[PDB]
Symmetry: C3
Subunit: 193 residues, 3 copies
């Protein structure tokens, strides 16, 4: 790993913290879409994309890769990752604070695993997916590409979620899909005074 890091990017601050938690001494913030074609003249420190938004993550990932930078994973030192889990190497993957990834799970490329999320044994988490704060996937769950799992959501064991799907905050997925969809919980209801 390099000693400084370029961070492209609120989610930028959190990525700075994870980078500094790993050995990084200096974070360099860039947030310039159009200046990106010139950035190839810069010293090749490690890069990270602190977006988003799957899908700007993905676009900018591709532009930065094609400009000769290495886009590393940021994994905080708190995360517990089984030696048999597969985390795509140098793939712009963010692994928060207190994440757990258990035996033979697979995390692909530019996934976000947000703080205290749990990926159980034998999960796949597809490319450019966002598993948010405290979201939990039970054993053998298959999350497709460009999915969003909202805060405190969960997925029961052995289930698949199709590409481009949204699981709302506090929702529990109970059924296999193959078709993309959106997947809401209950709403705290104000009690009337």
């Amino acid at each position: 790993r390099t000693e400084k890091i370029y961070i492209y990017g609120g989610h930028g601050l959190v990525c700075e913290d994870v980078a500094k938690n790993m050995g990084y001494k200096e974070c360099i913030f860039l947030d310039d879409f159009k200046g990106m074609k010139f950035e190839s003249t810069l010293p090749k420190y490690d890069f990270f994309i602190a977006i988003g938004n799957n899908e700007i993550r993905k676009k900018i990932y591709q532009k930065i890769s094609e400009n000769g930078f290495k886009i590393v994973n940021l994994i905080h030192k708190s995360a517990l990752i089984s030696p048999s889990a597969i985390v795509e190497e140098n793939a712009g993957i963010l692994i928060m604070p207190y994440v757990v990834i258990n035996a033979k799970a697979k995390i692909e490329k530019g996934v976000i695993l947000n703080t205290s999320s749990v990926i159980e044994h034998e999960c796949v988490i597809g490319e450019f997916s966002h598993v948010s704060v405290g979201a939990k996937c039970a054993g053998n769950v298959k999350i497709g590409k460009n999915c969003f799992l909202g805060i405190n959501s969960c997925v029961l064991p052995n289930l698949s979620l199709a590409d481009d799907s949204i699981l709302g905050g506090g929702a529990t997925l109970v059924k296999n899909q193959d078709e993309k969809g959106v997947f809401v919980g209950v709403p705290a209801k104000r009690m009337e005074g």
Copy 2:
């Protein structure tokens, strides 16, 4: 930090554990409202208030402060706190086991952050609030003073909760307030045999 600690106070036991996890060698239990005016004759070891109940916490906090004691924070050594987060110094704040507080969050004075709760980047948590076990605040959430977030509850990003509000166990807050209120989830329903 002092070597012994006075603990005013079930929540008392848990506070004893956190104090001992930090370097404290001896915990001294007091639970005497009326004897408190005499306690000023005692050796000034660090103090902690292991109530409650916001609001007895607050009252007793004020009486103990005015009697010449320092009321410290108890932060277990498991908690992960961003160097840019603000935790009010010496302010009777309890931070449990596996709590995470991310970049630029603010925790004020006599807050309880119970075990495995998560305070995301740029939260405020107002004075004498109780964020209970496994409760999670997404980025930029504003919790008012004397609020209660029930077990396994969550608040979606960018939302504010007004002073004196209650979020029930397992509930998800989805909407801005400014008015105080109470904010219930669903009830596991016994299936009939």
Copy 3:
């Protein structure tokens, strides 16, 4: 503790990881019901039962015990356990990644505490119960024997759950029982396109 471990048993892989996280150097997988009466001829390394299923756990536990093996607890080194908590010694108890067990809680014999679950102060968790991923018991909760708490479920403080009960994924228990029962949450609802 012995240097190798027999593991009887997906949940087997996860148990291998916990054993290796503790000092174990080699895991030996057995999954032979009928060959078990001969296994008494083997070297008496530590044993663990990586089932299940309460209740095969229990049956096989009893057969392996009667064959002269010690069935140890597997506790990952991440788990935080109050010095005043009681974890039944050498009792086939699995304690995952990021579990917290607070002051004066009791964990009996062949319980599963799955990853990031939380057992608050003064809980009992009865024999051969399964507290699953991210499930949380508030203070003074009594879980009976052979109970199942589903993923991301919770139990409010001071409540009892009777023997042989099931709490569904994402459900919140709000009421005392004494009678066994089953105890469902809400279902993420696909929104229609």
